[PDB]
Amino acid sequence: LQALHGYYQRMSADPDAGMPPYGTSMENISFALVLDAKGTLRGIEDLREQEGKKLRPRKMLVPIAEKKGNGIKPNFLWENTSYILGVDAKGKQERTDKCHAAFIAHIKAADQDLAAVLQFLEHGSEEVIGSNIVFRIEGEPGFVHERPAARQAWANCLNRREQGLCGQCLITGERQKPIAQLHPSIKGG
DNA sequence: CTGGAGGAGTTTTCGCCATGCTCAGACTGGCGAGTTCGCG
């Protein structure tokens, strides 16, 4: 319904409304890793919160996630242990190894922070297993994915992907627009 | 006779909580008036 499109367009114009900016979404995160600028990991930040009933993760604004079928798709900068640590509980190690290789490969598409995290990837409690994690530089505010250079790289990747076929958009009625081969998912439960 | 493969059919991965009472009376109030038949 175009009503939702109009509502988003209007309310996103308000800076404090809470609309995620284009290309970003709010997800669940449990821990953050701290590593020095030299590429050595030391320090883990656990952001999970006790909701009275249970200890549950926290909501964070991050780059949108792919819709993972049976195929392997690497997320940009935040992932679970299987892609990052090359470890899991699924037993099928080769799958995890392939995921890790794809994850490291996607990064290469000059910043010292990404240089450091690349350096750490030369090697890459139990509760971290299976949870979502993010990266932070030792004593650095914010997170690596928040740095402007990361945003430029993300925009470049988006431009890379949005190419080829073009047509008429039914919601807007405009011509020669790139057509979406797949739609992002919607939260259930 | 063997190949490459397009299509048909089967398997894997995906991610993974909640809803909260209740409580009480009235009221007291009077209808109506009436007429029967009659030889052999």
- DSSP for A118-155 reads HHHTTT--GGGTTSEEEEEETT-SS-GGGSHHHHHHHH
> Method of determination?
cryo-EM
- HSE, CB side, 13 Å, CA atoms: give it for residue A186: 1
- Measure A178 CA to B15 C1' (Å): 31
Find tokens 């709010």 and name the residue.
A26
The 8-class DSSP code of residue A55 comes to: E
Helix (H) or strand (E) holding A37: none
Q: What dihedral do alpha carbons A94, A97, A103, A107 form, nearest 10°? A: -130
Q: Is A139 left (phi over 0), alpha (psi -120 to 50) or beta?
A: left
Residues 42-71/A with CB < 7 A to strand B: 51-54, 56, 65, 68-70
**Which nucleotides of strand B come closer than 7 angstroms to any CB of the protein?**
11-18
β A79-80/A24-29 pair status:
unpaired
Resolution number, Å: 2.9
Separation between the CA of A181 and the C1’ of B4 (whole angstroms): 29
Is the Cα dihedral A67, A73, A78, A82 positive or negative?
A: positive
For A153, the token pair is 């790289």
Say which residues have a Cβ less than 8 Å from residue A43's Cβ, sequence separation at least 6.
A33, A34, A35, A138
Q: Which phi and psi angles does A188 have, rounded to 5°?
A: -125, 160
Per-residue HEC secondary structure of A71-83 comes to CCCCCCCCEEHHH
How many angstroms separate the CA atoms of A77 and A6, rounded? Answer: 31
Residues 74-133 of A with CB under 7 A from strand B: 82, 90, 92, 95
A16, exposed or middle or buried, with CB in 10 Å at 0-12, 13-18, 19+? Answer: exposed
Cα Dmax for chain A = 54
